[PDB]
Design a protein around this nucleic acid. Structure first.
Lengths: 195, 48, 88
DNA sequence: TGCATCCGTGAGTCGAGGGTAATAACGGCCTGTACGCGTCCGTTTCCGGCA
DNA sequence: TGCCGGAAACGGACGCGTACAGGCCGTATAATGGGAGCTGTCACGGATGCA
């Protein structure tokens, strides 16, 4: 398997980082198998499947909220059973509401878990729709979920092979022209970094 | 250093053609990378 | 066996057999990842002479791979007992 | 934007000087490597006659 | 005395029968995430991450 030369990655100035516009910490994470990196991404397929992927997300969210309201109605039936079993026998005033408070807490934690799942799906969709090359994907679990849900439309590896592919898909002429434009037009810190 | 490089490269080859989980394969690849880094410049990164 | 000179297997049959073939590999990797801890625990004590700790660990996972290839369930023994010998 | 944190580099010159932590151990086999007298080429004495 | 012209052992190539050198395989109760050594220089420059 390929390896990366230590001189051009670790040093006073990071040559690999300067060439790829990557921070040295992120570069170390990439080439030391601590974070995935997106080698390349397609534009036409994402562009023309955005609508159907949004529809699929809406359908999945509708299924999750249907499960949520099923949980709500199950909790309502459980609360009715608790009311029947507590408001018909001899019990303390606090004891007849202890079960109600417990059921309310269970309902709150259920809806909290549902909200967490909704937020997770939302951020997965956001990072898919804002995907771009030279982007690190921490949370290997999140990356794996993104891959299995969206195996197409992009490719992403991690390590020396990924860095080699990134260098392969690179345009030195366009990069030089862009940096020249930046050094002409920008000011201050951006101009210094561009230089 | 050359022995470590050769040993880790050979072990990576054996793991690859045998078929191993991504965790072990990536660990061996990192092993090879760190060994090559030590060979080229020992103590540049991490404990020498 | 059935690829050469075989038959055009039914779509459902072929997909189910491919699925179980994939699931076998999935289970093998699951077991390997689960039992890497035994490998590192056993390799914690062979350090200090010649090899490095991580190299010993890698040889341990090689031994564990061979152990899972040769392992069987019909004898009713725990997996750790059989894996320790191969790892060592 | 400023501030702290961190990293990396260099900081003498001439003799005198040389050897280290840390445990299953066997059967079955198997192919390979070697290597020890004998008869050949060849080189250091042989000895029969001799000048 | 020395020389001539072969003659006597001391050495290169061996099938053969044996020695062993080295390598592979396999062991069944159970055991399931490290030791570890550090951190008494001083000035300089610069890159990076965050308020």
């Amino acid at each position: 398997a390929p390896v990366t030369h230590i001189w051009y990655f670790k040093g006073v100035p990071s040559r690999l980082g300067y060439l790829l516009d990557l921070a040295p910490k992120d570069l170390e994470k990439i080439i030391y198998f601590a974070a995935y990196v997106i080698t390349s991404v397609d534009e036409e397929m994402r562009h023309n499947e955005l609508s159907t992927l949004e529809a699929e997300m809406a359908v999945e969210r509708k299924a999750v909220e249907d499960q949520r309201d099923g949980e709500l109605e199950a909790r309502a039936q459980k609360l009715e059973a608790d009311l029947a079993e507590l408001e018909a026998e001899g019990a303390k005033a606090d004891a007849r509401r202890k079960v109600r408070d417990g059921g309310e807490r269970e309902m709150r934690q259920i809806r909290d878990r549902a909200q967490r799942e909704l937020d997770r799906l939302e951020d997965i969709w956001s990072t898919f729709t804002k995907l771009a090359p030279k982007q690190l994907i921490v949370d290997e679990n999140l990356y794996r979920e993104l891959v299995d849900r969206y195996g197409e439309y992009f490719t992403g590896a991690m390590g020396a092979e990924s860095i080699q592919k990134l260098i392969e898909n690179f345009d030195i002429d366009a990069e030089a022209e862009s940096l020249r434009d930046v050094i002409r037009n920008g000011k201050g810190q951006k101009k210094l970094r561009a230089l | 250093l050359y022995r470590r490089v050769i040993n880790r490269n050979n072990r990576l080859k054996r793991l690859i053609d045998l078929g191993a989980p991504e965790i072990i394969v990536n660990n061996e690849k990192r092993m090879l990378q760190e060994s090559v880094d030590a060979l080229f410049d020992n103590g540049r990164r991490g404990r020498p | 066996e059935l690829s050469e000179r075989g038959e055009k297997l039914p779509a459902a049959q072929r997909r189910d057999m491919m699925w179980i073939c994939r699931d076998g590999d999935r289970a093998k990797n699951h077991l390997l990842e689960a039992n890497l801890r035994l490998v590192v625990s056993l390799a914690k004590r062979y350090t200090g002479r010649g090899m490095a700790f991580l190299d010993l660990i890698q040889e341990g996972n090689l031994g564990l791979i061979r152990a899972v290839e040769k392992f069987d369930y019909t004898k009713g023994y725990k997996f750790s007992t059989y894996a320790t010998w191969w790892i060592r």
